[PDB]
Design an enzyme around this catalytic site. Structure first.
Site, PDB file in Angstrom:
ATOM      1  N   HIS A   4       0.808  -1.219   0.000  1.00 42.32           N
ATOM      2  CA  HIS A   4       0.000   0.000   0.000  1.00 42.32           C
ATOM      3  C   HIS A   4       0.844   1.273   0.000  1.00 42.32           C
ATOM      4  O   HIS A   4       0.321   2.374   0.188  1.00 42.32           O
ATOM      5  CB  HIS A   4      -0.961   0.007   1.192  1.00 42.32           C
ATOM      6  CG  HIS A   4      -1.773  -1.245   1.317  1.00 42.32           C
ATOM      7  ND1 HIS A   4      -1.482  -2.230   2.238  1.00 42.32           N
ATOM      8  CD2 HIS A   4      -2.847  -1.682   0.619  1.00 42.32           C
ATOM      9  CE1 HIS A   4      -2.349  -3.220   2.098  1.00 42.32           C
ATOM     10  NE2 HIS A   4      -3.185  -2.912   1.124  1.00 42.32           N
ATOM     11  N   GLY A   5       2.151   1.110  -0.196  1.00 38.15           N
ATOM     12  CA  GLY A   5       3.049   2.251  -0.260  1.00 38.15           C
ATOM     13  C   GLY A   5       3.584   2.887   1.010  1.00 38.15           C
ATOM     14  O   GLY A   5       3.627   4.116   1.113  1.00 38.15           O
TER      15      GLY A   5
END
Ligand SMILES: CCCCCCCC/C=C\CCCCCCCC(=O)OC[C@H](COP(=O)(O)OCCN)OC(=O)CCCCCCC/C=C\CCCCCCCC
Ligand SMILES: CCCCCCCC/C=C\CCCCCCCC(=O)OC[C@H](COP(=O)(O)OCCN)OC(=O)CCCCCCC/C=C\CCCCCCCC
Ligand code: HEC
Ligand code: HEC
Ligand code: HEM
Ligand code: HEM
Ligand code: HEM
Ligand code: HEM
Ligand SMILES: C[C@@]1(c2ccc(Oc3ccccc3)cc2)OC(=O)N(Nc2ccccc2)C1=O
Ligand SMILES: C[C@@]1(c2ccc(Oc3ccccc3)cc2)OC(=O)N(Nc2ccccc2)C1=O
Ligand SMILES: CCCCCCCCO[C@@H]1O[C@H](CO)[C@@H](O)[C@H](O)[C@H]1O
Ligand SMILES: CCCCCCCCO[C@@H]1O[C@H](CO)[C@@H](O)[C@H](O)[C@H]1O
Ligand SMILES: CCCCCCCCO[C@@H]1O[C@H](CO)[C@@H](O)[C@H](O)[C@H]1O
Ligand SMILES: CCCCCCCCO[C@@H]1O[C@H](CO)[C@@H](O)[C@H](O)[C@H]1O
Ligand SMILES: CCCCCCCCO[C@@H]1O[C@H](CO)[C@@H](O)[C@H](O)[C@H]1O
Ligand SMILES: CCCCCCCCO[C@@H]1O[C@H](CO)[C@@H](O)[C@H](O)[C@H]1O
Lengths: 49, 379, 78, 241, 49, 380, 241, 81
Positions: free
Chosen positions: E14-15
């Protein structure tokens, strides 16, 4: 009697003796150049040194 | 409707089977085994799931996964004892349930009875495939003997056995499929139990005197809910006492040894609840003949309702039948005992005797004496 | 749902007391035990017999099996 | 042909339904396994950690484990290497496979002992009688070469030479290392090895019995209480007439 | 290994961005990468556990 | 008692009252076909599942290969696996359309049938999840990691529950063996609860497209709907088989053909298509716990539908404004589905939050609001 | 940074919904795997017996298997020994473990190829493009030592040197061994290796389509037949006087 | 469970039907069926289609925008040397 039986059954699903048996792992700092990141599996998860 | 206990589509069902259900006022302790059997079922399923969550169906890991369960899983050993012994408790209760049925002529409720037999057959298959899972010497060879029974069927016999095995002998595909079957069957038992109780409610329970109790019925609750809970704790003591103070009284020490395809144990002996049938299988020194005798020894139960000649339902007022009844029970003890001994004199002959009398009491003496008793009553 | 359509009953009166007005296990000695004995007695000669017989067949067959394991001195006399 | 001698019943201090295991005896028994039996017998299901808080302290257990060299790897080159044991390690196998085992015991296979007392009728009573019961064959009976006469072993000719004799070792607790003393201890140890839960099982059984006695009584009353209504109920038939 | 707008680490899921110290700088991640308790063979080895 | 067995027998009586003489509305459309299709997937899944279970081995060192052994060595093993894997999808396609029909025609006004319906959805989800993890490929492993770690977001008990569920410190063998057991069990809970579903339903019988009483025009289930249902079965069975037989891997992630590796996480972890829209929502909220709640709410919002009904009419058939609002919602779901398959980066991130926000807005505000507005335009 | 080049779609003779695999091509492909790729790549899931009746005759398959030495045992002494291969044996692993593999490939791990065409987006289209697409890096891009530029590999720096070139081997069926010809074959082989049921699946799909067309039609008629009663049904409201 | 007979109170309604064997299974395909399929299609296209058209656009855009942002911006190296 219910509280005990339910407690016993519940706990039968949490980490067993063999799993809780946790050791340490030694890592020589002469295999990692300056800046490098080596990963070592450990206690299931990845160990970052 | 003014009160939910009756209008609600779900409670309505609980109310009509466990609260307002009309029950005979005089049913005895022999009517307690129905609920006990239900509890074994719920108990077995619950402990089985818990065990299944640490089991591994593979010949190279079966035995040790069970060892891993008993040695490493919190209360794993306890859960295993409860499961293994629960299976015995299940058979003790099913046998007494059956006895009560034959004695009080509960079998005159044909559908309840017939499904009752289906339930027995299913419980047997369940116990069998389940017993094979730990993969010890006894698990392996018993699985070998039992599966080979089917090879006795003419023509399709060899073909069916190798099919069931998934190969040329009991092996890993047998084990994995047996695990699946063992997981599934209990639920068929639960389902069929509903059919059993559904047919039963068409007429409600029978009672010790074998005469209509419509003149004296009482709500299942709290009369039998309380009586049933009492019966539960009474049988629960021996169960726990056995499981907690004599875990291995009933098991063969041979099953503490990993299955060995090349070495068959010197004295292959089945679990106690199968002994009497094993005895019968051995009475006939002919492969196929012995299998048929075994099959008939259980399927004979489908015939009971048609061998009832008495003008009275139960045996309560039939002294001659009562004797004949206990003879049969004793006959079963003898068979059980004979089934645990080696095939040698005097056992061989004693066995064939007991086998022969078992079928004689059920197929000839019971209907004959029932007719004889009718005449002594001037009917 | 069966209560109400079970049977056609007439002229029967019954009397009962609240469970709190009575004793849970009354007349143990004057009634209970005497009846347990009655019941036991009326069934012992119906039940016991075949089991006694099974027991005997057991004792015999067991002893006979072990007896046949013993050595017969008359097999080595000469 | 099928002549067999069955062992007597010794009064083990752990035989009673509420009788725990004698841990001093289990500790000693371990030493016997470690210093004598392990040379030919594996115990695949017990690890050095199982000893902790049972027969040894953590410090001791660790020591015991480090005395052993265990194989591990592969390393970076994909090579297997040796390392000192950890409490999480299971007891060392004397041989790599049964073939090797037999090969080092005249074709005979010394069984793993983790569940031996449960895998034999008679349990410790049988293991004890076999260990202390070696003797010369009776007249008319000849034991083939490599086997030893033992009346307790089925067939009577076992491939295991008497493993223990007086002072074959020295208990560091000063107990007089006599043959029977040794057998009695190792047997106790074997009982534990087979059912480590032995003690806890019995403590539970105790509670089970108490709660059961109590609960069964209370429920009996309640059943009687509710049923009193019907038990003492009276009735009469008063037709009009 | 060595990716993210902080020269530390980057989680592809999800970064989540972490710096070379392993702290959470950008992304959904609630806390910093766990620092295991890590004995000390002077220099050349590290006993973690 | 009765002249014909179909009615007197205690078992047939039941079959007759639910599949033969059962009164059914004369005008129910194809949208009322998914109930029976759902029932057939269930029986189909169970059957293929047992068959697969008979060659499966729940152990991290053998899982992946036992499945391979099944597809490579077991007679028709490959076929049975395809039918099981793809059957799971047909199961969701059918459940989604079943729900859609429900919302559109106000079937939810049958509150108990609806609520048990939501329990069924939830159970199917759990089932598909634990099942998907069994083959133990990379996607099985990491998806199992992401999903289980969702629960760690619960405050206080979070970490404790996750480690409990895992049976250790991470997804590992005890997770796998317990997941197999769960996967084996749940389908049967689904079957059982289905009976409760249909039981509540029969209290009223089916609703119909016009949303007005059909008591004046009912027809026996057989042969009208038995025939209609069998037809619907073969119509949906074609795509299913076409997909399974001509495009077995159209729906799966190639990443799952690679044995799970605890140390390497796939670059683009993407869930099965039927979970994308929810995943999209989970990511809209850049806060761990907040995103989890949005996810939970995205499904549990279904329990609220019956209370957001303001229309004086049951269905949307005669409500043009709601119909638009309805298709907007459907398209909103497509957008979320698409967004859930893309990486967290502009413009996706914003598009995603929009779609998420409008999803909840349509359900919690627009639908009841428009329903009220429509009542007034009818002069009610 | 997020740039990637996706492979074109080649017209494989097995791409059509009813198109079987070209077995001549699969046979050749196997030779490429055996003589080139197997030096570094394992194929754990395929055994020599799988070749029979697909690409080779039983006699051939046996030969192929015997060319390999496999480890077996333990024997009588508990020793492991070597023996010639059997058709029931699976293809030989080039290394004992990934550690050794990396060790022999500069830290890079050549993946098992059993499911490679299914484990990569693009399948054979991607494997083909990678094998034939090596080239020098574009301006401004430098490949670290040990890696090779390949625009088709993600990141573009792969640890596998171009494995195939013209005449790197000779097809015993006389096909001109050109690089692209070799890639095309081995890729076809990989397709087969990943889904041995490929062909049968498609034959079933054919029958499924026919039976389905037929059955759907017949059932459509039956439904219409029974429903015609209601479909053409008429009604009227005739209230009294 | 059993409902036929106690459903509704209906009066003065006559209905007429023919056996399935006296009639055609799929009659008037061209004079009735298709004309109606068209009717049905028409009366719903502007209700359904629109939002999906919009979803499609948003998709086209967002996709193109994503790829566009992957491209190089020549104005980042104009004065590079
Ligand atoms: C099958 C596998 C066989 C395994 C071994 C069998 C187990 C043997 C253990 C013995 C079981 C204990 C039974 C002792 C009961 C003694 C007793 O009270 O008997 C007399 C008593 C008198 O009752 P009433 O006629 O109503 O009179 C009351 C006032 N007028 O009779 C009864 O209790 C009813 C009989 C029911 C018990 C049957 C249980 C026997 C179990 C064996 C299985 C047999 C069935 C299989 C048939 C095929
Ligand atoms: C959830 C996960 C999302 C996954 C992606 C969703 C799948 C998208 C594929 C599209 C589905 C095909 C639907 C096209 C149907 C076209 C059509 O005929 O529409 C008009 C037509 C007109 O009917 P009437 O008003 O009764 O008029 C008849 C004569 N008076 O309307 C209908 O068919 C009724 C609507 C039922 C279909 C609903 C299915 C949509 C599915 C998505 C899931 C949505 C629900 C979840 C909510 C939270
Ligand atoms: C030199 C190796 C050796 C030693 C040391 C040894 N054993 Fe054994 N043991 C064997 C062998 C070999 C057998 C196999 C006997 C047979 O099956 O013929 C055996 C068998 C046994 C058996 C029973 C086998 C059966 O079938 O009942 C037990 C129990 C046993 N040993 C216990 C012990 C114990 C406890 C010790 C240590 C006090 C011990 N052994 C030490 C070699 C040994
Ligand atoms: C000298 C050893 C060697 C030979 C010979 C070889 N490979 Fe490889 N191969 C590798 C290595 C090393 C990798 C690792 C590349 C990486 O991840 O950087 C690899 C990777 C691959 C990959 C793709 C990896 C990915 O992540 O996409 C495929 C497909 C492949 N090889 C196919 C082949 C085929 C087909 C052949 C024979 C025509 C072949 N290789 C022969 C060394 C070799
Ligand atoms: C999984 C096994 C079984 C379960 C759970 C079960 C359960 C029950 C229950 C709860 C009852 C009602 C209470 C009672 O009278 O005991 C009952 C009654 C009965 N069952 Fe079963 N049963 C089982 C097996 C069988 C078997 C093996 C038979 C016959 C071969 C049988 C025959 C009957 C009959 C005829 C009755 C009537 C009792 C009466 O006379 O009123 N049951 N059973
Ligand atoms: C009718 C109820 C059941 C009966 C009669 C029954 C009986 C048995 C028997 C005979 C055993 C062998 C015990 C032993 O090791 O000696 C067994 C093993 C086992 N059973 Fe069951 N069982 C029942 C239900 C279940 C259910 C529902 C499951 C799982 C969902 C299950 C799972 C297991 C497992 C995993 C084992 C292997 C572990 C072990 O051997 O202890 N059982 N069962
Ligand atoms: C395992 C999942 C399910 C199965 C097997 C199932 C099965 C059925 C069956 C057979 C019917 C009757 C025929 C029909 O109208 O389609 C039905 C109706 C219905 N179901 Fe389900 N259902 C499932 C899930 C759900 C879900 C997820 C919902 C709602 C969230 C739901 C809500 C309903 C409702 C409200 C009806 C009423 C239909 C009407 O308007 O007449 N069902 N279902
Ligand atoms: C509600 C029905 C079910 C659903 C939604 C379902 C779904 C799934 C899913 C998503 C998979 C993974 C497929 C893959 O490999 O990619 C799976 C695997 C599996 N399922 Fe089920 N399943 C269901 C019922 C069952 C039942 C009843 C059993 C067994 C008695 C079962 C046994 C299996 C087994 C053994 C696998 C592993 C082999 C494989 O991955 O192909 N399933 N299931
Ligand atoms: C528990 C047990 C068992 C259970 C029910 C049985 O009843 C049958 C089940 C199926 C078919 C025939 C009988 C038979 C054996 O399963 C099993 O392996 N055994 N062991 C055994 C040992 C020697 C010969 C035969 C069997 C059982 O007792
Ligand atoms: C099939 C699938 C799945 C199925 C149902 C789901 O629904 C839920 C079930 C239980 C709890 C929460 C959601 C979620 C995922 O299981 C699974 O591992 N994945 N994969 C995945 C990948 C990335 C993130 C999250 C999940 C699924 O899609
Ligand atoms: C009717 C039977 C009721 C059984 C109640 C007994 C409760 C078992 O008690 C158990 O005793 C063990 C030994 O101290 C503890 O370790 C367990 O945690 C405890 O639950
Ligand atoms: C909750 C305990 C249930 C025990 C199962 C008994 C069976 O079955 C019967 O079906 C009828 C119609 O649906 C119901 O009205 C009855 O109450 C129910 O007993
Ligand atoms: C954070 C809370 C930690 C509690 C630790 C639980 C330890 C359980 O301790 C238990 O005690 C029983 C009675 O002495 C023994 O019989 C059991 O074998 C033992 O495991
Ligand atoms: C055959 C399966 C039929 C669906 C179950 C409906 C049963 C509940 O239905 C009720 O009884 C009416
Ligand atoms: C993809 C490699 C296919 C080689 C086999 C060619 C035969 C394909 O054909 C099919 O094969 C199946 C399994 O062999 C059989 O069960 C089918 O009856 C047969 O038609
Ligand atoms: C609507 C469902 C239609 C199913 C019909 C499909 C029947 C396909 O039948 C299959 O064809 C294969 C191809 O040769 C054979 O190898 C298989 O043995 C055969 O069972």
């Amino acid at each position: 009697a219910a509280k005990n039986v339910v407690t016993q059954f519940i706990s039968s699903l949490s980490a067993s003796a063999d799993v809780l048996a946790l050791s340490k792992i030694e890592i020589k700092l002469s295999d990692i150049p300056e800046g490098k990141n080596v990963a070592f599996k450990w206690r299931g998860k990845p160990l970052f040194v | 409707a003014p009160n939910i206990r009756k209008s609600h589509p779900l409670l309505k069902m609980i109310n009509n089977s466990l609260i307002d259900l009309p029950a005979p006022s005089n049913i005895s302790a022999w009517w307690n085994f129905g609920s006990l059997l239900a509890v074994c079922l719920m108990t077995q399923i619950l402990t089985g799931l818990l065990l299944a969550m640490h089991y591994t169906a593979d010949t190279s890991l079966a035995f040790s996964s069970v060892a891993h369960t008993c040695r490493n899983v919190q209360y794993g050993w306890l859960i295993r004892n409860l499961h293994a012994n629960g299976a015995s408790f299940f058979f003790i209760c099913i046998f007494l349930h059956i006895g009560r049925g034959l004695y009080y002529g509960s079998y005159l409720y044909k559908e309840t009875w017939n499904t009752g037999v289906i339930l027995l057959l299913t419980l047997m298959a369940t116990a069998f495939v389940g017993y094979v899972l730990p993969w010890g010497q006894m698990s392996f060879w018993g699985a070998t003997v039992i599966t080979n029974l089917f090879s006795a069927i003419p023509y399709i016999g060899h073909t069916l056995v190798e099919w069931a095995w998934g190969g040329f002998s009991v092996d890993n595909p047998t084990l994995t499929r047996f695990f699946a079957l063992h997981f599934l069957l209990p639920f068929a038992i639960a389902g069929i139990t509903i059919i059993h109780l559904t047919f039963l409610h068409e007429s409600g329970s029978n009672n010790p005197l074998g005469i209509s109790s419509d003149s004296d019925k009482i709500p299942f609750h709290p009369y039998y809910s309380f009586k049933d809970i009492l019966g539960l704790t009474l049988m629960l003591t021996p169960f726990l006492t056995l499981a907690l103070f004599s875990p291995n009284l009933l098991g063969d020490p041979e099953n503490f040894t990993p299955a060995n395809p090349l070495v068959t144990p010197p004295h292959i002996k089945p679990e106690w609840y199968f002994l009497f049938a094993y005895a019968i299988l051995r009475s006939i020194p002919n492969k196929l003949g012995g299998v048929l005798a075994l099959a008939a020894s259980v399927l004979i139960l489908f015939l009971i309702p048609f061998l009832h000649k008495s003008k009275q339902r139960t045996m309560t007022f039939r002294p001659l039948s009562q004797t004949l009844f206990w003879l049969l029970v004793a006959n079963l003890l003898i068979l059980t005992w004979i089934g645990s001994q080696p095939v040698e004199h005097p056992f061989i002959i004693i066995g064939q005797m007991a086998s022969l009398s078992y079928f004689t009491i059920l197929l000839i003496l019971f209907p004959t004496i029932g007719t004889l008793e009718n005449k002594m009553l001037n009917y | 749902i069966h209560f109400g359509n079970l049977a056609r009953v007439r002229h029967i009166i019954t009397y009962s007391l609240s469970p709190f007005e009575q004793r849970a296990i009354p007349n143990i000695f004057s009634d209970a035990l005497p009846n347990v004995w009655r019941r036991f007695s009326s069934q012992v000669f119906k039940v016991a017999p075949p089991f006694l017989g099974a027991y005997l067949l057991y004792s015999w067959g067991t002893q006979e099996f072990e007896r046949l394991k013993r050595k017969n001195p008359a097999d080595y006399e000469n | 042909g099928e002549l067999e001698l069955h062992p007597p019943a010794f009064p083990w201090s752990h035989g009673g339904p509420l009788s725990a295991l004698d841990h001093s005896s289990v500790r000693r028994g371990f030493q016997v396994y470690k210093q004598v039996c392990s040379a030919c017998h594996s115990m695949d299901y017990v690890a050095f950690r199982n000893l902790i808080g049972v027969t040894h302290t953590e410090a001791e257990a660790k020591a015991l484990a480090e005395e052993v060299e265990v194989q591990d790897g592969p390393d970076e080159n994909g090579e297997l290497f040796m390392r000192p044991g950890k409490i999480s390690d299971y007891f060392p196998k004397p041989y790599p496979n049964p073939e090797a085992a037999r090969a080092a015991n005249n074709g005979a296979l010394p069984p793993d002992l983790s569940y031996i007392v449960n895998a034999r009728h008679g349990g410790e009573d049988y293991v004890f009688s076999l260990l202390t019961g070696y003797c010369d064959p009776p007249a008319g009976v000849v034991v083939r070469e490599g086997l030893h006469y033992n009346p307790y072993f089925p067939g009577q000719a076992i491939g295991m030479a008497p493993p223990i004799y007086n002072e074959i070792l020295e208990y560091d607790d000063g107990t007089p290392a006599t043959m029977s003393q040794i057998a009695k201890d190792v047997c106790t140890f074997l009982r534990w090895a087979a059912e480590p839960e032995h003690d806890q099982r019995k403590r539970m059984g105790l509670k089970m019995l108490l709660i059961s006695a109590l609960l069964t009584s209370l429920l009996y009353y309640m059943k009687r209480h509710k049923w009193s209504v019907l038990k003492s109920r009276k009735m009469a038939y008063r037709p009009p007439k | 290994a060595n990716s993210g707008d902080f020269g530390g680490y980057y989680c592809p899921c999800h970064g989540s961005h972490y710096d070379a110290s392993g702290r959470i700088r950008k992304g959904p991640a609630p806390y910093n990468l766990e620092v295991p308790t890590y004995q000390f063979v002077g220099d050349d080895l590290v006993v973690v556990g």
